[PDB]
């Protein structure tokens, strides 16, 4: 291609090219489109409809402040919108029915809309790390029962919906580290066998309302980890009471509390 380098499955590299918009006339059979590291500001998914075989779209580091969603990309499985400056998440369901991986990490989302994930029935991974979320809409994950990985790390969450994890029979990884959480709703984890949970870096308030969490931590000590930028060994003691001197939540007695 005159602007992007093509490799043949057909991978197209349009990255780090000072692009201000989608380059015209790309290979009709493009399968993977790299638009990473450019100067788009705004982008419309409808402009990609001509590429009926597109399964992976990377729009990371594109200075995006707005994302228009219309039309249909029927076989898109992965969408990377990380490292941009989107303030809101548009409704994607009607346009991306086959999506399994959605990454909107390191943006500036201040909230997620009601009914945000409707239609994303195949979603397996949702990354929202490094945004500006304070609370989440009820029923956020009702439309995505096949979710296996959920990352809400490094936001400013102050509360979690009691039923946030309802229906998630395949939940494998939950990242909630570095938020402003002080408690966990009774029954939050349900009977889910969650292998990897990251909960450190939060100002947990140890009082009678933390006992549900204390008991879950005791029962899941080997499933609590500390995040490390790399690729481990559990450390349940990483979850600490803020109203103390680094006292581990999993050892909080709760003396005198109603049982």
UniProtKB/Swiss-Prot annotation:
Domain LRRCT positions: 202-259
UniProt superkingdom: Eukaryota
Cystine connections: 4-14, 206-241, 208-257
Outcome after substituting residue 153 to V: In BSS and BSSA2
Effect annotated for changing residue 230 to K/D: Decreased binding to vWF
LRR repeat ranges, renumbered to this chain: 29-49, 53-74, 75-96, 98-118, 122-143, 146-167, 170-191
Record: glycosylation sites: 18, 156
Protein name per UniProt: Glycocalicin
UniProt organism field: Homo sapiens
